[PDB]
Design a protein around this motif. Sequence first.
Motif, PDB file in Angstrom:
ATOM      1  N   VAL A 151      56.717 -12.883 -60.886  1.00 37.68           N
ATOM      2  CA  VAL A 151      56.602 -12.479 -62.147  1.00 37.68           C
ATOM      3  C   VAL A 151      57.727 -12.605 -61.951  1.00 37.68           C
ATOM      4  O   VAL A 151      58.093 -13.781 -61.417  1.00 37.68           O
TER       5      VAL A 151
ATOM      6  N   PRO B 122      50.939  -5.022 -67.409  1.00 34.34           N
ATOM      7  CA  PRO B 122      50.301  -3.903 -66.646  1.00 34.34           C
ATOM      8  C   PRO B 122      50.668  -3.580 -65.070  1.00 34.34           C
ATOM      9  O   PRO B 122      51.689  -4.496 -64.771  1.00 34.34           O
ATOM     10  N   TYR B 123      50.746  -2.626 -65.152  1.00 30.56           N
ATOM     11  CA  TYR B 123      51.852  -2.339 -62.757  1.00 30.56           C
ATOM     12  C   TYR B 123      50.970  -2.453 -61.938  1.00 30.56           C
ATOM     13  O   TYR B 123      50.202  -1.749 -62.062  1.00 30.56           O
TER      14      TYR B 123
ATOM     15  N   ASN C 197      60.274 -11.432 -56.252  1.00 29.21           N
ATOM     16  CA  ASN C 197      59.470 -12.053 -57.800  1.00 29.21           C
ATOM     17  C   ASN C 197      58.134 -12.954 -58.027  1.00 29.21           C
ATOM     18  O   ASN C 197      57.480 -13.073 -58.570  1.00 29.21           O
TER      19      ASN C 197
ATOM     20  N   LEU D  97      54.720 -10.165 -55.837  1.00 29.37           N
ATOM     21  CA  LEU D  97      54.096  -8.431 -55.922  1.00 29.37           C
ATOM     22  C   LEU D  97      52.886  -8.632 -55.677  1.00 29.37           C
ATOM     23  O   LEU D  97      51.867  -9.485 -55.886  1.00 29.37           O
TER      24      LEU D  97
ATOM     25  N   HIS E  17      53.428  -2.119 -55.404  1.00 22.75           N
ATOM     26  CA  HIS E  17      53.480  -3.288 -54.767  1.00 22.75           C
ATOM     27  C   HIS E  17      54.652  -2.831 -53.434  1.00 22.75           C
ATOM     28  O   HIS E  17      55.560  -2.207 -53.461  1.00 22.75           O
TER      29      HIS E  17
ATOM     30  N   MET F 167      51.271 -13.234 -63.502  1.00 25.44           N
ATOM     31  CA  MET F 167      51.348 -11.768 -64.735  1.00 25.44           C
ATOM     32  C   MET F 167      51.579 -12.351 -65.800  1.00 25.44           C
ATOM     33  O   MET F 167      51.843 -13.384 -65.878  1.00 25.44           O
TER      34      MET F 167
HETATM   35  O1  0SY Z   1      59.763  -9.497 -64.318  1.00 17.17           O
HETATM   36  C1  0SY Z   1      60.479  -9.048 -63.701  1.00 17.17           C
HETATM   37  N1  0SY Z   1      62.347  -9.140 -62.816  1.00 17.17           N
HETATM   38  C2  0SY Z   1      62.310  -8.754 -61.883  1.00 17.17           C
HETATM   39  C3  0SY Z   1      61.149  -7.540 -60.516  1.00 17.17           C
HETATM   40  C4  0SY Z   1      59.628  -7.162 -61.849  1.00 17.17           C
HETATM   41  N2  0SY Z   1      59.300  -6.390 -61.391  1.00 17.17           N
HETATM   42  C5  0SY Z   1      58.652  -6.607 -62.121  1.00 17.17           C
HETATM   43  C6  0SY Z   1      56.736  -6.118 -62.109  1.00 17.17           C
HETATM   44  C7  0SY Z   1      56.383  -4.627 -61.390  1.00 17.17           C
HETATM   45  C8  0SY Z   1      55.494  -4.133 -61.028  1.00 17.17           C
HETATM   46  N3  0SY Z   1      54.180  -4.281 -62.248  1.00 17.17           N
HETATM   47  C9  0SY Z   1      54.607  -5.221 -63.090  1.00 17.17           C
HETATM   48  C10 0SY Z   1      55.143  -6.403 -63.146  1.00 17.17           C
HETATM   49  C11 0SY Z   1      58.603  -7.728 -62.749  1.00 17.17           C
HETATM   50  C12 0SY Z   1      59.664  -7.863 -62.752  1.00 17.17           C
END
Ligand code: 0SY
Lengths: 318, 90
Positions: free
Chosen positions: A157, A97-98, A144, A146, A101, A80
């Motif tokens: 992540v 960015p999203y 952690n 995705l 998941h 990420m």
């Molecule tokens: O940094 C994180 N720690 C626990 C869970 C988590 N989900 C996300 C996330 C989810 C969807 N897109 C980007 C980052 C990031 C994180």
Amino acid sequence: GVKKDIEKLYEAVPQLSNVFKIEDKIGEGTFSSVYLATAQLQVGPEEKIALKHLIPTSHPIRIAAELQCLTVAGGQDNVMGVKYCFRKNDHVVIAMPYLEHESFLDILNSLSFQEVREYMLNLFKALKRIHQFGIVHRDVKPSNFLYNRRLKKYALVDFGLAQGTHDTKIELLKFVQSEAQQVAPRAGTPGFRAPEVLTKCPNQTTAIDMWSAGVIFLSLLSGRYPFYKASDDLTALAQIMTIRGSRETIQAAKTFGKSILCSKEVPAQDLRKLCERLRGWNEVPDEAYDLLDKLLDLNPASRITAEEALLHPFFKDM
Amino acid sequence: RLKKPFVKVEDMSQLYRPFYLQLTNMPFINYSIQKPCSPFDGYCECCLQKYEDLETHLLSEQHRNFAQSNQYQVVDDIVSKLVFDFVEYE
Ligand SMILES: O=C1NCCc2[nH]c(-c3ccncc3)cc21
Ligand SMILES: [Zn+2]
């Protein structure tokens, strides 16, 4: 309910109002919470964005340390990256960015065997990447990592718990204290922690993340999650000895300075029978269990590494 | 000397006090429980002090000082090296 949380996030970091339409809270954790947001990109499209709000009791070095991992290692090889970050005093919010998941529990007993090779493959790419920089992730577990099953996209992540190898290419990691000494170390999930971590070993290398990947693979192979259900470290270890053998665990721990006593001897399990009994799934090749065996090597010195894992025969031909 | 079942971990070079686990029963691998069940089925880093209720600690002056101090410069440094690319409204 969450309406209050969201509202308070805008109250905390004023600048967010200008940029994000915060739509929902998607996660909470010990050290942070994660929101879903929409923004407009200067380049034209609208983007879905994850906003991770850190807990204001976090040390500044820890904050910067996490952020630096995301800047240097992130954005490539299923790791990420970071778009931008906003602060207002002690409230920091990281924007990413999203990635839509799955729940691990959900897809768990529904993946084809091929999807399991692909998943494992893609997790080792990510760990190869972070390991090159000398980042010890320390909290590798399915939540952690995705996974988008439809798009076949992946993402490691959370560096909120990371440490460095003694020669880390990531400067700030050097100010993070190890649990061995008692910024402060952060506790991770017992069930994904390697025996050298469970036994409080002062020398902790990237091998600890490989063991975590092994546990994930164990869950994929056995169809059970969480595989190790423990709330403290020793319980976790006792469960590990039940799988890998108490003698084998005692011997291996001698090699890293720990003397383990256990009053009930338990033999090592054959990994194939174990997984088969706990359950392309008709012809899981030997290479799969052979790899699992190398990942769950009780000896951190001999444990397989991320780049070695990518060359395993399990992964011909991809 | 120790009631069974137990586990003891000692640091071979004395760098630690031993630590211990005592259970009613040792873990046992249950192949009969159903998929997906396991077969085995605070502190402010800033102020270096424990608390009980976060809400209050956040308003305490020890924390409010830190919160407002220059300490976050290392964050700030990493931040001002990234490229903003969203639209900002007034
Ligand atoms: O940094 C994180 N720690 C626990 C869970 C988590 N989900 C996300 C996330 C989810 C969807 N897109 C980007 C980052 C990031 C994180
Ligand atoms: Zn504080």
